[PDB]
């Protein structure tokens, strides 16, 4: 691969592991917060096949963050703010040029389990086709 290739694979890397990251720490059998942090209600991308494709993460972002202000302060280095502020600033990168591209959602919302998992899924994907 090239070396602009390589450094896209690494910001999805690091996208990656801090959605990992959130998702694990919340979605556990010791969170005892689970229960009211699955009643949010997250807007889903309608096709997430291209970089592109993050501006629908960007834009829900401010309620993830919002959302991990319910979880254990303990199950995370940095304060959801600082944590939510850098996968922003890859997001905003990796997404490329902002044309005339605001993303198309789904009409089926989903909790923040579904959501982390399609946005984790996506940038594996991405990943392996790169």
Same mark, same amino acid.
């Given at each position: 691969?090239?070396?602009?290739?390589? *450094?896209?694979?690494?910001? =999805? &890397?690091?996208? +990656?592991?801090? $959605?990992?990251?959130? #998702? !694990?720490?919340?979605?556990?059998?010791?969170?005892?917060?689970?229960?009211?942090?699955?009643?949010?209600?997250?807007?889903?991308?309608?096709?997430?096949?291209?970089? *592109?494709?993050?501006?629908? =993460? &960007?834009?829900? +972002?401010?309620? $993830?963050?919002?959302? #991990? !202000?319910?979880?254990?302060?303990?199950?995370?280095?940095?304060?959801?703010?600082?944590?939510?502020?850098?996968?922003?600033?890859?997001?905003?990168?990796?997404?490329?040029?902002?044309?005339?591209?605001?993303?198309?959602?789904?009409?089926?919302?989903?909790?923040?389990?579904?959501?982390?998992?399609?946005?984790?899924?996506?940038?594996?994907?991405?990943?392996?086709?790169?």
């Amino acid at each position: 691969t090239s070396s602009s290739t390589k *450094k896209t694979q690494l910001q =999805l &890397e690091h996208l +990656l592991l801090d $959605l990992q990251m959130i #998702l !694990n720490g919340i979605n556990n059998y010791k969170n005892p917060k689970l229960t009211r942090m699955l009643t949010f209600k997250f807007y889903m991308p309608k096709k997430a096949t291209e970089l *592109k494709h993050l501006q629908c =993460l &960007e834009e829900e +972002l401010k309620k $993830l963050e919002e959302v #991990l !202000n319910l979880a254990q302060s303990k199950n995370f280095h940095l304060r959801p703010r600082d944590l939510i502020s850098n996968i922003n600033v890859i997001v905003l990168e990796l997404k490329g040029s902002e044309t005339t591209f605001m993303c198309e959602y789904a009409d089926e919302t989903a909790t923040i389990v579904e959501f982390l998992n399609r946005w984790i899924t996506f940038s594996q994907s991405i990943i392996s086709t790169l």
